[PDB]
């Protein structure tokens, strides 16, 4: 890294106000219909959101036992922003090592724990359930057939992006990025805190973003210094944050933290979602870092819309019968 993080954390020059601070009860479908989920949202308490979380003193060792000691986990090497892998037992050891003896800074942001014991312990906001494409568009019998709890593409029956556990040590930094497929994100701060930088997905900004990704020379440029307006903002424990489609953000970890969050596409900002997918196509993002089965999901979305409105199905007979069987449950 070539720029100075301590200063990015210190300056008041990131003074834009993008966030709507909001009551949980106000984040409903009508809100979605009227505003198109265009603005980052913060809920300073969980009231009326519909969320469930684990025991407040849940530790990374408890995460390890729910998902398995031997499970392979993607771990980011903070100083290179490149990925490596270890087992959860090894991650746990690293995470439990006292701060001074930790040789390197490592971050885990990509542990998806659906179809493990942990998954029932976490519930996302009710409103997200109502709009998530995975829940509302993907054929249900395929989703329910999923047994594999890792993200192995060949075992994946549906886009397995709903429930992530993030475990970051003090000093962790994730550089500016847009989430895959222009998914929106919900992030709950269970323990610790996070600092986000937010840059709005204007046409100009997304062009700077794409150009920055194509440059390669990225540890050099702090992208928040290139745009007209950027909001730095601190989430504290108990807060729930929602990032809209296409928002460019970077995140710093000031204290040891544990976050539960998830990604979702929805029907109210499709054009941004398509725009992001095609940035990924152009900059050659490898498949592993992209939303699985994206165009497949898009096809199913069209079919659901036509069916729910006009009652003409464009699913195979077999698929209609499977759907019918679950309606009968």
């Amino acid at each position: 890294r070539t720029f100075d993080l301590e200063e990015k954390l210190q300056t008041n020059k990131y003074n834009a106000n993008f966030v709507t601070f909001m009551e949980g009860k106000d984040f409903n479908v009508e809100y979605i219909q009227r505003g198109g989920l265009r603005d980052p949202l913060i809920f300073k308490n969980s009231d009326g959101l519909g969320i469930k979380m684990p025991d407040p003193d849940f530790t990374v060792n408890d995460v390890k036992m729910c998902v398995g000691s031997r499970r392979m986990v993607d771990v980011m090497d903070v100083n290179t922003q490149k990925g490596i892998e270890m087992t959860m037992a090894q991650w746990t050891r690293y995470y439990e090592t006292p701060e001074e003896e930790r040789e390197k800074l490592y971050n885990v942001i990509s542990l998806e724990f659906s179809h493990t014991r942990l998954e029932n312990m976490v519930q996302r906001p009710s409103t997200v359930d109502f709009i998530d494409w995975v829940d509302n568009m993907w054929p249900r019998h395929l989703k329910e057939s999923q047994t594999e709890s890792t993200n192995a593409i060949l075992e994946m029956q549906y886009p397995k992006v709903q429930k992530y556990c993030l475990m970051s040590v003090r000093g962790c930094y994730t550089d500016f990025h847009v989430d895959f497929g222009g998914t929106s994100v919900w992030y709950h701060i269970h323990q610790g805190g996070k600092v986000f930088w937010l840059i709005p997905p204007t046409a100009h900004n997304l062009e700077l973003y794409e150009n920055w990704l194509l440059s390669g020379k990225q540890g050099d440029i702090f992208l928040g210094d290139r745009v007209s307006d950027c909001q730095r903002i601190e989430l504290k424990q108990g807060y729930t944050f929602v990032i809209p489609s296409g928002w460019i953000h970077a995140v710093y970890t000031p204290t040891d933290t544990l976050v539960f969050g998830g990604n979702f596409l929805h029907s109210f900002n499709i054009p941004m979602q398509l725009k992001i997918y095609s940035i990924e196509d152009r900059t050659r993002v490898p498949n592993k870092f992209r939303y699985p089965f994206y165009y497949e999901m898009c096809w199913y979305v069209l079919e659901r819309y036509v069916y729910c409105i006009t009652n003409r199905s464009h699913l195979t007979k077999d698929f209609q019968k499977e759907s019918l069987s679950m309606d009968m449950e």
Binding site: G83, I109, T174, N287
Partner: peptide, 10 residues
């Protein structure tokens, strides 16, 4: 070496 998808990372 099983391929994966849905991996969050910049």
């Amino acid at each position: 070496a099983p391929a994966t998808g849905g991996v969050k990372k910049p």
